[PDB]
Write a protein that binds this ligand. Structure first.
Ligand SMILES: [Zn+2]
Ligand SMILES: [Zn+2]
Length: 105
């Protein structure tokens, strides 16, 4: 598997480290729809809207099974640590037309 999960459930945005790699979730888009990180980096998504959103990697992308992230409320965060190089597309489960990617290099 190509990513590990530091926290199975969403956590408070106030707990995200200074300097962290962050993708804000907005209504109309993940604010960084194509993010490049280094192998071993942790990416943190933070929901900035009241509408719940998540991140969802379909089966085959981070491994054999899908990785459907938990639904995040406003000012909640969720992190993934990417352990192999590759390009990993994801989307928001309830709003599947909103999509992003992480390029790990
Ligand atoms: Zn790059
Ligand atoms: Zn959404």
């Amino acid at each position: 598997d190509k990513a590990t999960i530091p926290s199975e459930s969403p956590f408070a945005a106030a707990e995200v480290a200074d300097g962290a790699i962050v993708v804000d979730i907005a209504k109309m888009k993940y604010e960084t729809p194509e993010l490049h990180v280094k192998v071993g980096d942790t990416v943190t998504w933070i929901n900035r809207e009241a509408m719940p959103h998540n991140v969802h990697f379909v089966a085959g992308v981070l491994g054999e099974a899908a990785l459907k992230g938990p639904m995040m409320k406003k000012e909640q965060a969720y992190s993934l640590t990417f352990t192999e190089a590759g390009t990993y597309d994801y989307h928001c489960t309830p709003h599947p037309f909103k999509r992003g990617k992480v390029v790990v290099e």
